[PDB]
């Protein structure tokens, strides 16, 4: 059970250590099998579909590396987590070219096992064209 | 003074009625003179600079018209408002072509006059190229 913002931040940090590793075999450790994901106009239902969409992104941006920071994490009485911070990206073929944008993540947790059942990520995708 | 989420939602609705009207002479009714704005990589300081950036947007997309809906509005104990919903845009010359993206707004209020002193807007801008 996540009850404090510090516990929420610790969980989101754990989530993004898995996500930014792109070790898809571990995504199910923190993401529900029935995950509802929204990222702009991109939407997926189910953990497998989310994984396939991420794999497609890594082929659009070959050598993609990502990392994340957060400066404010809120926990609502409904249990939803709002996390405000930044999203970094670069290509392995040119690691000195880093694109960083503000990002907000909204996370709804499963009451049974604490996994993320809904994840909505808000960031401007336009700056990442600079990686090409 | 805003103390309930219902009051926060009522305020944000009034704010976007002003913003989507593009009546810059009234922006100061709800926005602080020292407004700190961030929308992706776009950042401005001061109400006049925010207004000038919006005018530039309306010249990039001649006939730009916008509207907004919200389905969740939260009020933190710090006073900050988080609002999740959608942002719609079209051109007056082709009103049937509507682009709609998810959006979250984060609003910090001035304790003196209740105006927005910091506004952070998160949406993917890439879909709006389809207006051209």
From Swiss-Prot, chains A, B:
Gene3D superfamilies: 3.10.450.50. Pathway: Antibiotic biosynthesis. InterPro entries: NTF2-like_dom_sf, SnoaL-like. Part of the gene cluster that mediates the biosynthesis of sordarin and hypoxysordarin, glycoside antibiotics with a unique tetracyclic diterpene aglycone structure. First, the geranylgeranyl diphosphate synthase sdnC constructs GGDP from farnesyl diphosphate and isopentenyl diphosphate. The diterpene cyclase sdnA then catalyzes the cyclization of GGDP to afford cycloaraneosene. Cycloaraneosene is then hydroxylated four times by the putative cytochrome P450 monooxygenases sdnB, sdnE, sdnF and sdnH to give a hydroxylated cycloaraneosene derivative such as cycloaraneosene-8,9,13,19-tetraol. Keywords: Antibiotic biosynthesis. This is Sordarin/hypoxysordarin biosynthesis cluster protein G. GO terms for biological process: antibiotic biosynthetic process. The keyword Cell division does not apply. The lineage of its organism: Eukaryota, Fungi, Dikarya, Ascomycota, Pezizomycotina. Pfam families: SnoaL_2 (PF12680).
């Amino acid at each position: 059970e996540i009850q404090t913002p510090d516990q929420a931040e610790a969980f989101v940090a754990k989530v993004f250590d898995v996500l930014d590793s792109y070790d898809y075999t571990r995504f199910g450790e923190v993401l529900s099998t029935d995950l509802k994901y929204e990222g702009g106009l991109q939407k997926t239902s189910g953990l497998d579909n989310f994984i396939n969409d991420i794999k497609a992104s890594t082929q659009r941006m070959p050598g993609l590396q990502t990392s994340h920071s957060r400066y404010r994490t809120e926990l609502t009485a409904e249990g939803t987590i709002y996390s405000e911070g930044h999203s970094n990206a670069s290509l392995e073929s040119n690691p000195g070219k880093v694109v960083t944008v503000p990002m907000i993540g909204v996370f709804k947790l499963d009451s049974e096992d604490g996994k993320i059942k809904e994840m909505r990520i808000y960031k401007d995708r336009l700056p990442f064209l600079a990686l090409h």
